[PDB]
Structures are given as structure tokens and as C-alpha cells.
Amino acid sequence: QSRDCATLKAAVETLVFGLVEDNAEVERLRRSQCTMKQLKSWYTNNFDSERRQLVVILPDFECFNASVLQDLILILSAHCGSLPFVLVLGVATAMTAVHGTLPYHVSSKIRL
């Protein structure tokens, strides 16, 4: 949600905490130790033996900050190959807003 993603640090903590607590709900760690290192260790510990995708739902795409969104897309695109990420969006207005709020270097790594 856009309300819990004011900074990049809070958005990464919200993402890793949401994935780990989705795992704990389907089958408590503090938010200080919610990083991509712990997420990669947990995904290598649990789901490598079976691929389970990691879906990141963004319901309000327009209400997000621009810089936090671009750094989040670059973070999720940096970790592909090791963690299977699928991204869906919730864009309300049109596709021109998507192509306008995403710069050249961010849209270089997008297959929408």
C-alpha cells in the first residue's frame, strides 16, 4: 500500500515482512531485520526443494512516490534469477501515466 511506502527502507521492510508473514499465515520477526538478505536466505531454505513465484501487488499506482517506485523496481529487477518476482500494478488513469512516470533506465528492465 502507498501509505506504508513513504521511503525506500520502509517499502523494502513492508515487502519482506508481507512475504514472510504470508508464509507464516498460509502454513514474529521485528521490522529491523526485514531485508532482502533474510528474504533470500528464507527462500533458499524453504522453497528451493520443490518454482514458487513472488507476486507484488501495487493497488494504487498513481499515489506512490516516484523515486521510491523507481528504486523499488530497480531493486526487484536486480534480484531476478535468484528470486522469481512477478509484479502487478493497479493503474487507474491510462497507460500514458505508466509510460510517463517510468524513466528510460527504469523501463529498460520492464516486460509489461
Binding site: K37, E62, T93, A97, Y104, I110
Partner: protein, 398 residues
């Protein structure tokens, strides 16, 4: 050092001299490494993939301990040092504790070994231009980590900027600058023609059509197709991945008269110039309420007109700034329906703000007091489309 180059030359055509230079510098692990290497270029030049495959081959063939980062993940230094010490000192578990740079330097000093096993360490920090936007004592320490830790390590940095943007007030150490030049048209044609075998296997694995598809899909035909493609798309972009992902689709369009039984430049030059308008879009009618449409065109008329021009029209150098009372006055002037001021209209103003169709150029904390300013961020053709689906001509009030 030649085995790594011989293993990297098939995977990276037309990248010969960079692989030879990186095999001179950090090729063999018995020789000492330079203090820091900084190779840079444009987007799509192939530096993340090149150093990633180079680090994988060095960790596979020799006794080095590689590491690969990304400096957008490292918003503070502790995460960066924990990832570095997980990669450089493996299989330690959750009992790895790094508080600052000093504990990291001591725990790397503990990894020193003898002079017979010929060990090395290799750190690659992708998106290095963020390293100058953090706590300011990570860049010189990353430059002189070989002298500090007294190890045989090299710190590789990857960015799109030259190194002239990295100097601070306190100064930096010495670095080995390396440039990855972008390809011209012939080398881009060779790179786009490298995947001819995968193209032929994909067109074989998907019947007189397939039997005629096997006889003329060959190397010279694909070379003429890539020549006709690069004769029209090289003007806009020189980047390899966009050209690959677009040349695949234009090839799938290009082949259909040859499979349906010059002779081909017009039939593709229609859709090639139709697809040049679809470059830089990676894609594989906006409905609004009535009063939201009128509020949107009233905000456009408030942003596109001067304050002194409103008195002549309504009485009966970007967009300008305006307050909410000006928007409401222009809306009730151009409405000619004279509805009341309810909750839903100001709620429509607020949800037009939250749809990024308006903005808050200033104020934004005293919105109720009236000192907040707005700014309309739409063009002219959407305003005229809204005015056509409503029936209100905006070409008069401009």
C-alpha cells in the same frame, strides 16, 4: 588468465578488448590485483552481465571469493557490509555481526591465508553512482580496502557516469578507469545476428509452411533482414536489448509472405515505420464523471489563462498557479447548470488531486485555510476530447 577470456568470447561477441583488459588486470589469482577498477559506459553496453559472468568464471576456475552488489539495496552501510561479509566469508549463518566499517575490516583481516593457495577476493558494486549519496566514508574505504585489510582483493565499480563526478572535498585514492564503448552499426548487426541458431530452432519448433521455412531462413536472409531493420531503427536507439526484442517481433511479421508463398521492403516498411512510433514502450478512453470533467477543464482554463484575463471572459512558461476558490469560481462560471456546493464536489477536487490529474505546487498543509495552490497537469488534446464528449468548446475560452 586466457582460459577465462576463451570462455567469455563466445558469450560476448564484439567485446574483445574489454575482456582482454579484464584478463590482464584481474585474470589470474596468483598475480596481485589492482586497488580498484571502474569500468563505465552507456545503458545496454553489457557491464552487469560481463562482470557477472566474469566473476562466475573466476569463482569456478580458481580460488577466488567473489561478491556482487547493487548500491540501491544499500540505503545504509550496515546492510551493504552484511551482504559483503556473507559473500566473502560464506557459510556463517545468522551469527554474522557487523556494526560498522571497523568490524568489517577486522573480519576481513581474519581471512588472510598463506602464500601457496593463491587466493583472491573480487567485489563488484553495480549502480555505483549511489555510493556518493550515502554516509560518505564508504567510498574511500572501498577504494583502499586492499591496503586496509591487507588482502589480495580488487573492488570493481559499475556506473554510467565518468569518474569526474565521484571526487569529494577530502579526495580519493587511485583507480583504474576503463571504458566500454557502445557499438556502431556493424557490430550491432553482428550481435543481432549471433542468435540466428535460436531463431531457426524457434521457427523449426512451431505442413508445407515449415518445410519451406527450413530452406530459406538462413544466414544471408537474416543478414539482409537485419540490414533492412537497422537501416530504419538505428536513428532512434543504439541499445542492444530494445533492438533484439523489437527485431524478434518485426521478424515474426516479416516472414509471412515468404511462408504464404527487393520484394519485401514495402510489406515490412509499412509496419516498421508503424513500430518506430512504438519504440521505448515495452508493451507486449479514461472515464470520468460529469462534474469531474467540468472541474478538470476548469482547472485547465485556470492554469492556461492569466489572472487578469478572467474578468473579461467569465462575467457574461508552464501552467500557472491557482487556488481552489479560483477553480470553483471558473467552474460555476462555465457550468451554466448552477448546482449546489455539496460534499461530493470538493471530494471530486480531492480525488482529482489523488489521481495525479492535478497537483499541489505549494501550500498543501493549509488546504482548508485557502493558502494552498493547485496546478493542472494535462495537455490540450485530452481537454478537447473531454469537451467533445461533453459539448463544451474550450477553443472559445482560450
Amino acid at each position: 588468465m586466457e582460459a577465462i577470456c576463451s570462455s567469455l568470447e563466445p558469450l560476448f561477441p564484439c567485446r574483445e578488448a574489454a575482456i582482454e583488459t579484464l584478463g590482464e588486470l584481474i585474470g589470474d589469482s596468483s598475480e596481485t590485483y589492482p586497488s580498484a577498477i571502474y569500468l563505465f559506459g552507456h545503458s545496454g553496453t553489457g557491464k552487469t552481465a560481463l562482470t557477472r559472468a566474469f566473476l562466475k568464471e573466476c569463482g569456478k576456475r580458481q580460488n577466488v571469493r567473489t561478491a556482487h552488489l547493487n548500491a540501491i539495496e544499500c540505503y545504509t552501510t550496515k546492510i551493504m557490509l552484511e551482504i559483503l561479509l556473507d559473500s566473502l566469508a560464506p557459510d556463517q549463518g545468522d551469527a554474522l555481526k557487523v556494526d560498522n566499517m571497523l568490524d568489517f575490516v577486522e573480519q576481513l583481516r581474519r581471512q588472510a591465508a598463506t602464500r601457496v593457495e593463491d587466493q583472491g577476493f573480487l567485489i563488484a558494486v553495480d549502480n555505483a553512482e549511489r555510493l556518493r549519496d550515502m554516509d560518505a566514508n564508504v567510498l574511500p574505504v572501498l577504494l583502499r580496502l586492499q591496503e586496509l585489510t591487507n588482502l589480495n582483493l580488487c573492488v570493481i565499480l559499475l556506473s554510467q557516469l565518468p569518474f569526474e563526478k565521484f571526487y569529494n572535498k577530502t579526495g580519493l585514492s587511485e583507480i583504474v578507469c576503463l571504458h566500454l564503448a557502445q557499438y556502431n552499426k556493424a557490430e550491432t548487426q553482428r550481435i543481432l545476428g549471433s542468435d540466428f541458431q535460436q531463431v531457426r530452432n524457434q521457427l523449426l519448433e512451431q505442413k508445407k509452411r515449415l518445410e519451406i521455412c527450413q530452406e530459406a531462413v538462413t544466414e544471408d536472409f537474416y543478414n539482409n533482414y537485419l540490414n533492412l531493420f537497422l537501416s530504419v531503427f538505428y536513428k532512434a536507439c543504439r541499445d542492444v536489448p530494445e533492438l533484439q526484442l523489437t527485431a524478434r517481433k518485426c521478424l515474426s511479421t516479416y516472414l509471412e509472405p515468404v511462408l504464404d508463398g527487393s520484394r519485401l521492403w514495402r510489406h515490412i516498411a509499412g509496419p516498421l515505420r508503424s513500430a518506430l512510433t512504438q519504440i521505448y514502450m515495452r508493451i507486449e478512453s479514461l472515464e470520468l464523471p460529469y462534474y469531474a470533467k467540468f472541474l478538470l477543464i476548469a482547472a485547465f482554463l485556470a492554469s492556461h489563462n492569466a489572472a487578469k484575463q478572467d474578468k473579461r471572459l467569465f462575467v457574461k512558461l508552464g501552467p500557472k498557479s491557482f487556488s481552489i476558490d479560483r477553480l470553483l469560481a471558473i467552474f460555476y462560471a462555465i457550468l451554466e447548470e448552477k448546482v449546489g456546493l455539496t460534499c461530493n464536489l470538493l471530494s471530486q477536487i480531492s480525488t482529482l488531486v489523488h489521481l495525479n490529474l492535478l497537483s499541489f505546487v505549494s501550500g498543501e498543509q493549509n488546504i482548508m485555510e485557502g493558502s494552498a495552490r493547485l496546478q493542472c497537469t494535462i495537455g490540450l488534446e485530452f481537454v478537447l476530447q473531454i469537451g467533445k464528449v461533453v459539448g463544451f468548446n474550450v477553443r472559445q475560452y482560450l
